Amino acid sequence: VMYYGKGDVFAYRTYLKPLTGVRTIPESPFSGRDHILFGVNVKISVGGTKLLTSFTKGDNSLVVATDSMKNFIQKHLASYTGTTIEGFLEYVATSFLKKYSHIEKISLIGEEIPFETTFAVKNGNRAASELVFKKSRNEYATAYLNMVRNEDNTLNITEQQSGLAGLQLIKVSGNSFVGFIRDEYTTLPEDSNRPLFVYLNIKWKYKNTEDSFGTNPENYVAAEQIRDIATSVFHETETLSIQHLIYLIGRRILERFPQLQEVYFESQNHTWDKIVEEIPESEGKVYTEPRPPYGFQCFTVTQ
Amino acid sequence: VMYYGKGDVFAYRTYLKPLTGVRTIPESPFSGRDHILFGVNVKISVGGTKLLTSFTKGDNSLVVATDSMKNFIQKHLASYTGTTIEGFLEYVATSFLKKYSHIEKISLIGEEIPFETTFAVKNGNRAASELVFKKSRNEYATAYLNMVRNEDNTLNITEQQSGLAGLQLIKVSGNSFVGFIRDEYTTLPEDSNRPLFVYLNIKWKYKNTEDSFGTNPENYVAAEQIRDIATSVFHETETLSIQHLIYLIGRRILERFPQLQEVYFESQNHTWDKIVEEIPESEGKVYTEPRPPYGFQCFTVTQ
Amino acid sequence: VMYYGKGDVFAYRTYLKPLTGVRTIPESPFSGRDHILFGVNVKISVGGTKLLTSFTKGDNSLVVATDSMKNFIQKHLASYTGTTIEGFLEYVATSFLKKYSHIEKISLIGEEIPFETTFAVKNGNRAASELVFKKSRNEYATAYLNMVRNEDNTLNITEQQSGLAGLQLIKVSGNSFVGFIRDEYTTLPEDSNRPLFVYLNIKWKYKNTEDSFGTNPENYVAAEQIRDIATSVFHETETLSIQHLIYLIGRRILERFPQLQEVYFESQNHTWDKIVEEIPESEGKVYTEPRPPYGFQCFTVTQ
Amino acid sequence: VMYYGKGDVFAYRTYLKPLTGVRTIPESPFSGRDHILFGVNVKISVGGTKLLTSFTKGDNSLVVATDSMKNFIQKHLASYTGTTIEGFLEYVATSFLKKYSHIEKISLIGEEIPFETTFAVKNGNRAASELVFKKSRNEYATAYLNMVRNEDNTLNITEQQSGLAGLQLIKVSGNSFVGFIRDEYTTLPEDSNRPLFVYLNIKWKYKNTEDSFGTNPENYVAAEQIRDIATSVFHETETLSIQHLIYLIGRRILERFPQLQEVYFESQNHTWDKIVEEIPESEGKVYTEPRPPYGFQCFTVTQ
Ligand SMILES: O=c1[nH]c(=O)c2nn[nH]c2[nH]1
Ligand SMILES: O=c1[nH]c(=O)c2nn[nH]c2[nH]1
Numbered sequence A, B, C, D: 001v002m003y004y005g006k007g008d009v010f011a012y013r014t015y016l017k018p019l020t021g022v023r024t025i026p027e028s029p030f031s032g033r034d035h036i037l038f039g040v041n042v043k044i045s046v047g048g049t050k051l052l053t054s055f056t057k058g059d060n061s062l063v064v065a066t067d068s069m070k071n072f073i074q075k076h077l078a079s080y081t082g083t084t085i086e087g088f089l090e091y092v093a094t095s096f097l098k099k100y101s102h103i104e105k106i107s108l109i110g111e112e113i114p115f116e117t118t119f120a121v122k123n124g125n126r127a128a129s130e131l132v133f134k135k136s137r138n139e140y141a142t143a144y145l146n147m148v149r150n151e152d153n154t155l156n157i158t159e160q161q162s163g164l165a166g167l168q169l170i171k172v173s174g175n176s177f178v179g180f181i182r183d184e185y186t187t188l189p190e191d192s193n194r195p196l197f198v199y200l201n202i203k204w205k206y207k208n209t210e211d212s213f214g215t216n217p218e219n220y221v222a223a224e225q226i227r228d229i230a231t232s233v234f235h236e237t238e239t240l241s242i243q244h245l246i247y248l249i250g251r252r253i254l255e256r257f258p259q260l261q262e263v264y265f266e267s268q269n270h271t272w273d274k275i276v277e278e279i280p281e282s283e284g285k286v287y288t289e290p291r292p293p294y295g296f297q298c299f300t301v302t303q
C-alpha cells in the first residue's frame, strides 16, 4: 500500500443547481432536491509510483500538500455545475488527474451532511422556510468513486458506488426470530413477536456509471427513495430474521431500479430487551437498552 | 452534598395513552402525540439525612440499591396512565417518596428518546406506518422535577422545568453581526450577511405546576410547539446577534403561552467559515467547518 | 440569568515555568511538573447588567466578541509567568476585568489536556524524551474560578475549585455490596466479592484561595497527588459500597492536606457483569460490559 | 458477499497465564505481561454457502444465533490457556469451526482493552497494586485472523495480522515540511520547525503465523515494543514529512524483528495551528486546535 490524502473535508454550498425530474417510485414521494443548502464531507486518497521517494527519501518535490487537496475540493464545489454528490466526485477526480499528471489513481468518498426543512409563518400560514434549515444527525447519502490514469493517458472510472448510511428503524411488532440452532451455546429464547430494531447501511452500483451522475435524472437512484423502500418493505413483511428482511428490501430495490446492478447491505441488530411482558388493559409492553454486543449481517443482492 | 441515584435508565413503552387536544398555536401544527412508541431516558437522585451512615460507616441497611431504582422506574412506566414525561416524573416521584419514608428529596430528569414516522405503501398509496419508526438523533423534549417530604409528612414539588434540547438551526442569509467592540483583541470582521448556525436548548417553567402534567391538555406546552416557534422567529427576523434572536424567540413563546412564567435559553454559535465569496452566475457561496471554539449565550425571559 | 462567552478554547504552550518545590505525601511520588508542554481547554463566561440591550435591542456596542475572548485567552497563555492552571485562570480573570470596565462578573473553567512522557534511544541509552509526548485521553486536572468587580472597582474572587476528572479504576477483588434493602423492587443479588469499577471526579476547595495558585508551591494540592490517594485507599479498603469508599478517600485527602476546606466526589458504578464463576485450575473468572444504567453518588467531606 | 456475526463482544478475564520469555530490543524495556486483568473486545464474522436460505427464505435451521456466538467467545476466554490475543483468536476460530460443520469461513478481530498499574501504600511502602487498575483510553493492541474449512474438513489460517491502534504522538520541534508543490491550489506556508502531531495505527504480519501465538514467546512481537520503536524513531528523526517518518519507523521495526514480513501504517496529521510565535524571555510558543480536515497516509514497508 502507498497512498495519502485528506479526510474530513467539509464543504457547504448554497444554491447548487437543483436536482429535478428524477423518475419517481411508489414507495417514495421523492422527485428531486432544491439544493438551497448542499453539504458534503469528502475524503480524497491519491496514489502513484512517483510518490515513492516522498516516503523513502523525504523528497517533497512531487507532494501535493494535503492542505492543497482540501483547497482543490472546496474550490471545485464552487465551480461544480451539476446536481449530485456522485457527479461532484467525478468532477473532482477528472479535474485532479488532469491537473496532476504524476498521480495514477484517485479514490473519493463523499458523505452528505443532511438538512431538513422547518416551519415558518408566511402571510398567516405555516410553510416550509426557504431560509432556515435543521441540521440532521440521522441518515445520509454517500458516494464513492475510484478513477485511474491508464498507460495511454486516458482516464477510467474503475469503481463507483452510491449509498445510504445511518438508517435506524424499529418495527414494534410483526417480527419473529425462531427456529435457530439450540445447542450447548444457546441461551436466546425464541421470540414470536419482537420489536426488531435494525441499523441499515445500503449501497448500490449502477450497470452504467453514467447514470450515477444525475445528468439525466430519469436514471438517477436517490438515497431518499432507497430509504422509503426500506421502510415500506419492513412494514409490509412479517420478518423472520434481519437476514430475511434485507434480502426482501434488496429484491424490491432491484425491481424498482432496473438500471442497478447490485445492492449491498450492512445491517446491525439493536433490539431492546423486554422488561414488562403484560400491562393490564393495554397491548403495551416496556423494554430497555441491551448490553453492548450487537448482531450484524452483510449481504449482496444482484440484478 | 449527599445524594445518590441511577442514570441512563432507558425505558421504552408501547401504546402509552395518547396525548390529544393540546391547544394549538399558529407557528406549529402540533396537537398531540399518538404514543405508539414512548421512549425516555431517566436520571434519579435521592437524598436524606438518614443516608449519612451509608457513607460514614458503610451501613447499607437504608440503601435502596441503585439497581432497584431502575426497576422502580421501569415498572412505573408500565403502570403510568398519563400522557407526558412531566406527568411520568410526578408519578415516579410521588410513588417513590410514598414507598421510602427515609428519603427526604427526589430529583428526576427525563429526556425523550424521539422517533419519527416512516412511509409504507398501504392499499396502493404511501401513508405513515403505524408499525415502523425511525430513531431520531436530532432534537428532543426534556423534563425536570424536584419533590420533597416536609416535616408534617406532606409532599411538595419544589421545582419543575420542561425543555427542548439538541435543536440545530442554520439560516442561510438575513443575519448580521456588526458594531461589536474593536480593540487590540479584535480580529473578527464585521459580517453584514452571515449563515448563522445556532444550537438551541430552551427550557420553560409554568406558573402552575399542574399544567405541566398534561391532564388538561389545553394548558400543556409541547416541546414540538417551542421548536416551531424558534424556527418561525428565526426565519422572520433579520438577526443582529444570537443574543437578539433568543430574546425575540422567548418573547414570542411567552406571548403564545401565557401560562408560562419564564423561558431560559442556552445557545451556541457554530457558524461556518466562508471559503468562496462569489460564484459566477450564482448567488451561492462555499463554507467549511470552523475551528473548535464556540460562542455561547445564556438568557432568561420572564412573563 | 444573563451571560455569554466562549467554550472549547484550546491552547497549548511550550516551556511554561516548571512547578517544583511541592510538598510530598506518602501516597504519591509526585514532585512537580516539567511543563515542556502545557495544554489547557478554557471556557469563559462574562456577565454584567450593561449587557442587557445586547439581548433586548440587538445593540452590540458593549459586546466583546466571543472570538475576541478566545484571542484574549490565547494571548494571555503566551504571557503567563506562573505554574498552574489555577494561577492561569486568575491571570486571565484579573486581566479581563481590568480591560473591560462594563463586565461585572467572569467565570472560568480550565481543563488540563494531559500528555505523557515517551522514551527514545540516544547517545547509547534509552531515556525520557524532551521532545516527543503522548497525548492522553485518561484523567486530567481541572480548575474553576469566579471573579467579580465591586462598586469601587476592586476585584474579588468569589469562588475557586480545583479537581481531577476522568479517573477510571477497577479493583478486581476485595469489594462487597450486601445488606441493602430487599423488597418488591429488589432483584440485585448480594455480592461478597465483586470487581468494583468506579469512575471518579474529585474536586477540592482550599481554605485560602491563594494556596491554589502555586506561587508558594509547598501549599499547592496537585491533582496527581489526589489521584494517588484515591488509588491507594481503594487498594487498602475492603469496600462495602462506593459510598463507603469515597468517604474514606475524602478523609485521607483532608488528613493529608490540612489546607483544604472540603473535597467533593461525583462517582459512577460501571462494574462488569459476571459470566463465568469457576474456571478449572485457576482463580480467574470472565466478566462482560453491563447494560447502560449506572449508579452514581455525590458526596462532600468537610474539614 | 454473505456473512453475519457479532460485534462489541467485550470479555474481561482475570489471571490469564502470564506472557514471559520475550526477546528484548534496545528501544523497549518490555519484558512481558502480568495478565492479572486481560480485557478484549471481539468481533466475529462467519460465512458459508449453506447460509443462503437464511437470507433468501427466512430459514433459520442453520443459523447459529449471534447471541450464541457471544456466549461461545466468552466461554472460550474462560478456558483459554494461552498468553496472547492472537492465540485467543486462533483458539476461538478452531473451536468454532469444529463445532459448526456448515461454516466454511470465520474472521475474527480482537482489540485489547488496556489497563494500567496503580500504586498503594501497604506494609510501610508504596508499591504496584496487584488489585487496583486504571482503565486506559489510549493506545491498545489488536489482532486479526481468518480461518477456512477445506473440502477435506481440515482447517487453515488464510490471513493473520497484529497491530497497535490509537497511538497519538506530538513532537514539539525538530520537524519540517518544505519543498512541496506550490501552485494555484497551494496556500500552506513552508515550515522549517513545526510541532508535528501524528496519530498512528501500525499493523504487522509475520513470516510464519505460528510466531504470532506466543507459544514460543521469544518469537512474538509485542505491541508495546512497536510503540516504543515508534516513539524512539520520532525523537531521533529530523522529520521531513509524516511520509518520511513512517518509512523510517517501518525500517526500524523490520530491522528489529527479522521474523516479520511487513509493517503497514495508517497515519493522520493533527498538528496544531500556531497563534503566538515570539514570547519575551522564553523559548515557548502558543498553539491551538486546527479546523477538522486532516491529512493521512497509508504505507507498507516490506522485509
Ligand atoms: O435477525 C436476527 N438474526 C440473527 O442472526 C440473530 N441472532 N440473534 N438474534 C438474531 N436476529
Ligand atoms: O451572535 C453572536 N454573538 C456574539 O456574541 C458573537 N461573538 N462573535 N460572534 C458572535 N455572534
Ligand SMILES: O=c1[nH]c(=O)c2nn[nH]c2[nH]1
Residues within 6 Å of the ligand: B004, B063, B064, B065, B066, B067, C177, C188, C240, C241, C242, C243, C269, C295
Ligand atoms: O456501591 C454501590 N452502591 C450502591 O448504591 C449500589 N446500588 N447498586 N449497586 C451498588 N453499589
Ligand SMILES: O=c1[nH]c(=O)c2nn[nH]c2[nH]1
Residues within 6 Å of the ligand: A004, A063, A064, A065, A066, A067, D177, D188, D240, D241, D242, D243, D269, D295
Ligand atoms: O507530513 C506532511 N505530509 C503531507 O503530505 C502534508 N500535507 N500538508 N501537510 C503535510 N504534512
Ligand code: NA
Residues within 6 Å of the ligand: A024, A025, A026, A027, A028, A029, A030
Ligand atoms: Na412516487
Ligand code: NA
Residues within 6 Å of the ligand: B024, B025, B026, B027, B028, B029, B030
Ligand atoms: Na395551529
Ligand code: NA
Residues within 6 Å of the ligand: C031, C032
Ligand atoms: Na523533582
Ligand code: NA
Residues within 6 Å of the ligand: D031, D032
Ligand atoms: Na519481566
